[PDB]
Design an enzyme around this catalytic site. Structure first.
Site, PDB file in Angstrom:
ATOM      1  N   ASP A  33       5.518   3.073  12.327  1.00 58.59           N
ATOM      2  CA  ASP A  33       6.495   2.574  11.369  1.00 58.59           C
ATOM      3  C   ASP A  33       7.580   1.774  12.065  1.00 58.59           C
ATOM      4  O   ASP A  33       8.079   2.197  13.118  1.00 58.59           O
ATOM      5  CB  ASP A  33       7.092   3.800  10.640  1.00 58.59           C
ATOM      6  N   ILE A  34       7.919   0.628  11.506  1.00 56.53           N
ATOM      7  CA  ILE A  34       8.937  -0.233  12.105  1.00 56.53           C
ATOM      8  C   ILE A  34      10.371   0.218  11.836  1.00 56.53           C
ATOM      9  O   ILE A  34      11.292  -0.322  12.462  1.00 56.53           O
ATOM     10  CB  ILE A  34       8.764  -1.669  11.736  1.00 56.53           C
ATOM     11  N   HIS A 102       0.641   5.911   1.148  1.00 53.60           N
ATOM     12  CA  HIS A 102       0.758   6.040   2.587  1.00 53.60           C
ATOM     13  C   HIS A 102       1.271   7.390   2.958  1.00 53.60           C
ATOM     14  O   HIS A 102       2.173   7.963   2.293  1.00 53.60           O
ATOM     15  CB  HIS A 102       1.686   4.934   3.175  1.00 53.60           C
TER      16      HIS A 102
END
Ligand SMILES: Nc1ncnc2c1ncn2[C@@H]1O[C@H](COP(=O)(O)OP(=O)(O)O)[C@@H](O)[C@H]1O
Lengths: 116, 115
Positions: A33-34, A102
Site C-alpha cells: 500500500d502506498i 481488497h
C-alpha cells in the site's frame, strides 16, 4: 468491462501503472500500500472485479478465501512472525474508498483495539 | 477435540450461552460479548483452526464461507451503510482467542487506521 475493472486497481491489475508486487497468480494480486498505516501494509485483491463484499456471490467463496490464504502466506514471507491484522472495508461506514474488493494486511507494530 | 479447547469451543458445543445469530454445518455467528460498535459480531468455523497463520490451502473455501456468512448476517442485522471485517493474528494483531474468528463491525463510522 475490462479485465480488472474500472477502478485504480484495474490499472494495477493490467500493469498500466506500477505497484510493488509481492505475489501474483491467475486469481489475485498482492502489493504494498502506498499509504501505509503500519511498517508493513499490503493489499490482496481479486483480479475479478467485485465492487464490494456486500455484492459478492455465493460462488465467490473460494476466491475470497484465497485472498486470505494469499494474505497469510505473504505475511509470513514478509517476516510478520509477531502477528498482523487483516481488514476488509465495506461501504461508507467501513471507510471503503476504492470500489474493488481488497484485503488489507497490516503488521510490524502493535495493533490496537477497537480496529477503528 | 472437535471445536477445540477455547471458550469458542464451549460456545460451539452449546455448553455456555451466546447471542447466536446464525448457524450452519460448518460455522457459527454470534454477537461479540465485548462490542466495539452498535453491531459487532463474530463468524467462526466449527473446525478448530487456532489462527489464520496455520490455515491450510484446503481451508480456502471455508474461510471464504466465513466472509459470505458475515456479509449475509450483516444485511440481516440492518447494516446498509457499511461495515468492517477483521481477522486478528497473534500478539501484534491483538488476537484474543486462539480459534479463528472474523469480526464484523458496523452501525457507526469506522475510522482509519484500523487500530
Ligand atoms: N496505486 C496504489 N498503490 C498502492 N495502494 C493504493 C493505490 N491506490 C490506493 N491505494 C490504497 O488502497 C487502499 C484502499 O482501501 P479503502 O479500504 O478503499 O480506503 P482507506 O482504507 O484509505 O480509508 C488504501 O489503504 C490506499 O492507500
Amino acid at each position: 468491462a475490462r479485465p480488472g475493472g474500472d477502478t485504480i486497481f484495474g490499472k494495477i491489475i493490467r500493469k498500466e501503472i506500477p505497484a510493488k508486487i509481492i505475489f501474483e497468480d491467475d486469481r489475485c494480486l498482492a502489493f504494498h500500500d502506498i499509504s501505509p498505516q503500519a511498517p508493513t501494509h499490503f493489499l490482496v485483491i481479486p483480479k475479478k472485479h467485485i465492487s464490494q463484499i456486500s455484492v459478492a456471490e455465493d460462488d465467490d467463496e473460494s476466491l475470497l478465501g484465497h485472498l486470505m490464504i494469499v494474505g497469510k502466506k505473504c505475511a509470513a514471507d514478509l517476516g510478520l512472525n509477531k502477528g498482523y491484522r487483516m481488514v476488509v472495508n465495506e461501504g461508507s461506514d467501513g471507510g471503503q474508498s476504492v470500489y474493488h474488493v481488497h484485503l488489507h494486511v497490516l503488521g510490524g507494530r502493535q495493533m490496537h483495539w477497537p480496529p477503528g
